[PDB]
Design a binder for this molecule. Structure first.
Ligand code: HEM
Ligand code: HEM
Ligand SMILES: Cc1cc(N)nc(CCc2cncc(N3CCN(C)CC3)c2)c1
Ligand SMILES: Cc1cc(N)nc(CCc2cncc(N3CCN(C)CC3)c2)c1
Ligand SMILES: C[C@H](O)[C@H](O)[C@H]1CNc2nc(N)[nH]c(=O)c2N1
Ligand SMILES: C[C@H](O)[C@H](O)[C@H]1CNc2nc(N)[nH]c(=O)c2N1
Ligand SMILES: [Zn+2]
Lengths: 411, 407
């Protein structure tokens, strides 16, 4: 089958053939689209076809499909599976896997960079202390004094689901949130639940507005242990505005390194439940979402006051005006401090080029329009006018439940 | 089978029981979502009529009543006999309001029950259509206090006697492909403008020429008519702060009136059913003015603001975009023409959505279209999960008449 996508700004039409290699489900049906829904221990039975599907793809990619090496590897994996009920990936396969999981991430606008990913193999890790060390090394490497480098660290795969490695933090670096008895929130409201756990686990909270959370690290299905990332490894950027001098006095800063740590990495049917990965920020993540979401730092009001906008009626677009200025300040600050960041105009333009390239050389590029379009100024970016097809390819990054909801406590 | 939608800003969860009454298809499959794609006989007819009559009689609390059965019978006899059937005035109005109610891409549906329906099924000629359309324009415009309206022309018979409004909106500005290679007026309307010229229109080759109506009656050849200028309410665009903004020479019309869709009710097809409400400000200032393939004025405005247009990271585009939309809202409000900003409108949609879930079991919604084209995440709709599905009565897309016209 052929599927066409049109860009309504340029009339450029592209033809998808890659969707035929789609596997997993979308959530949608012929009667309902679930396009805007955030979120819609394996047998050897299901395991070898998934292993084989993956190895066929790997060996095609290296132009060795049907080779003796290809055939031997299949044979080798088949037996390891029937002997031991699972199998081990070669380093090459692991690196290929992780790069492709990112390449396949339909919600990621930054995918033009997918082939440049530093893969850290942490499959020899056995304890939370070992995890802490690997994660420190990842943070130092990825930060690179502000010249950020994409990286992923891969801890041992799931076995029986009873010995999972998990990073309990949703991101490696994030600020605490503290709910006050008066109902107000100190710090990042997003992180109140996790902060409470940390405190419960023994963390001494400074109770400031921008406290870097400790790492809560779980190895081999044991109870998680707390660790503090050395502060010297945590690069932060004081936020100021190039024209408004009062902006610095808001007392805002943000960390440089966005590093997702709660997702599951699936490769050839194997499940890596601890796989922190990091790139660099697109400005709107901080300036639009982190600062201006009503459920986050929520600073539109205070910024708007200081700008003396007309705040009596929404039709003054005071919220819109303040939002822009804040996003200007975020970009200005990172650039001024030589910390890697990308504006939404740049990142969406690059994505369109990436996407067209992927259609030509790959037969498609699965993309989630809902996530790809930036949270401000949507239609003045080229992705808004771009039809996209969303489908699931493996290897992939998947959501998994939060560990505190599933963990069987040892005590 | 019962579905939940969550609002990630408020944690409010709603349960959709209404999608189970959807019949038409989304374009999506288990393997591929097409949520962002813009365009995804007597035996056929009676169950469609029945489905509709059933929901109609349910609405007036007379389900399984004698009148219900009688009507069902009557319509059945009539299809058996005539191969179609005619809607009672009450059913036409109910159906039109519900077509709007079911429009999953429409953010303004909180107004759905307050829609003035003009029955033009007695129309036979294009001159008759022109008269009805002028009356609609005048009624809906109402000196600037806009009132939603729809005018419904005769239903399709054999597809060779179609009534069609060839225009996409009752009121739009012409577009001309220049020898300078650029484009004068609205680039969106080049093709239509040419057809107007090929059909006789004398273009005043300006930048904001209100297009003539091109009207097709009973499947016959389409005719040109010019809307009385005094019925077309336009608004000069000025900025409350920037004195220079007026020099751009920008204006827009007050009445958004979609004229190219198909109204399906009880299996019957109304190929000519122009409808109108009032603008949300972003439709003009974000899309009509700042879209690259439209008036595309971002650069001119940014220059007049003397912004650093060297690097994209200065967000000069974003700044001009906000100001432009400020001016649009300011101009309309200053001239007392009804308009709604994207904050007010989305806030209304959330309340409508909650009303609908509570009193109907759901509200089909297309997030890709409901979220405004600027400042998306600072509006409540961004954080709102929506389920998209197709209910009837409905407004459907249909082919442009000129690809299908047997001249
Ligand atoms: C290089 C710079 C990168 C940029 C600028 C970038 C940008 C983004 C943005 C803006 C999002 C949407 C999340 C949100 O806005 O809330 C996203 C999502 C995502 N990114 Fe990237 N990204 C980058 C690197 C990476 C890397 C290295 C990986 C993995 C190896 C990755 C994998 C993903 C995945 C799996 C999602 C989906 C998250 C979810 O489903 O919640 N990205 N990215
Ligand atoms: C009264 C105030 C109204 C407002 C503020 C409003 C707002 C909107 C907006 C912003 C859109 C997105 C379309 C675009 O951006 O091009 C839309 C779509 C739509 N509206 Fe409403 N509208 C109103 C009245 C109506 C009425 C009276 C009807 C029908 C009786 C209607 C039917 C539709 C339909 C069918 C669509 C989808 C059109 C398409 O798919 O191209 N609207 N509306
Ligand atoms: C590697 C990377 C780079 C970047 N610029 N942004 C991101 C996404 C940031 C992000 C922020 N908040 C939330 C999420 N997701 C992650 C997955 N999590 C389970 C849900 C929320 C992701 C990731
Ligand atoms: C009644 C009404 C009110 C309003 N504020 N906006 C609209 C939609 C405006 C609009 C602009 N451009 C295009 C479309 N649609 C019309 C149907 N057309 C076939 C596709 C594009 C609609 C309609
Ligand atoms: C309900 C809706 O899907 C939800 O708010 C989505 C919308 N698009 C998004 N896009 C990005 N990049 N990140 C997000 O968290 C979301 N949230
Ligand atoms: C490709 C994409 O679906 C297309 O640009 C859509 C996106 N959302 C939209 N939303 C509205 N309200 N109006 C539009 O024209 C569009 N265009
Ligand atoms: Zn879908």
């Amino acid at each position: 089958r052929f599927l066409k996508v049109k860009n309504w700004e340029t009339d450029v039409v592209l033809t998808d053939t890659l969707h035929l290699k789609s596997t997993l489900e979308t959530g949608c049906t012929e009667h309902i689209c679930m396009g805007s829904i955030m979120l819609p221990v394996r047998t050897k039975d299901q395991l070898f076809p998934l292993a084989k599907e993956f190895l066929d793809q790997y060996y095609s990619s290296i132009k060795r499909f049907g080779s003796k090496a290809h055939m031997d590897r299949l044979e080798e994996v088949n037996k390891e599976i029937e002997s031991t009920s699972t199998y081990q990936l070669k380093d090459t396969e692991l690196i290929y896997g992780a790069k492709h999981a990112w390449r396949n991430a339909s919600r990621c606008v930054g995918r033009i960079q997918w082939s440049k990913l530093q893969v850290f193999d942490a499959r020899d890790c056995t304890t939370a202390h070992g995890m802490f060390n690997y994660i420190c090394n990842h943070v130092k490497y990825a930060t690179n004094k502000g010249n950020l480098r994409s990286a992923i660290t891969i801890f041992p795969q799931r076995t029986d689901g009873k010995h999972d490695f998990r990073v309990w933090n949703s991101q490696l670096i994030r600020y605490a949130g503290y709910k006050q008895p008066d109902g107000s929130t100190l710090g990042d409201p997003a992180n109140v639940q996790f902060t409470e756990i940390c405190i419960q686990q023994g963390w001494k909270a400074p109770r400031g507005r921008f406290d870097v959370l400790p790492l809560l690290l779980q190895a081999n299905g044991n109870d998680p242990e707390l660790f503090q990332i050395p502060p010297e490894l945590v690069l932060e950027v004081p936020i100021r505005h190039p024209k408004f001098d009062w902006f610095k006095d808001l007392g805002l800063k943000w960390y440089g390194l966005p590093a997702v740590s709660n997702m599951l990495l699936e490769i050839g049917g194997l499940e890596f439940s601890a796989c922190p990965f990091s790139g660099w920020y697109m400005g709107t993540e901080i300036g639009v979402r982190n600062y201006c979401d009503n459920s986050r730092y929520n600073i539109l009001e205070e910024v708007a006051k200081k700008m003396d906008l007309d705040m009596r009626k929404t039709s003054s677009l005071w919220k819109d005006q303040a939002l822009v200025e804040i996003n200007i300040a975020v970009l200005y600050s990172f650039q001024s401090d030589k910390v890697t960041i990308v504006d939404h105009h740049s990142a969406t333009e690059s994505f369109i080029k990436h996407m067209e390239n992927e259609y030509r050389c790959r037969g498609g590029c699965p993309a989630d329009w809902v996530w790809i379009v930036p949270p401000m100024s949507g239609s003045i970016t080229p992705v808004f006018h771009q039809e996209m097809l969303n489908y699931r390819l493996t290897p992939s990054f998947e959501y998994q439940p939060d560990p505190w909801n599933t963990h069987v406590w040892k005590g």
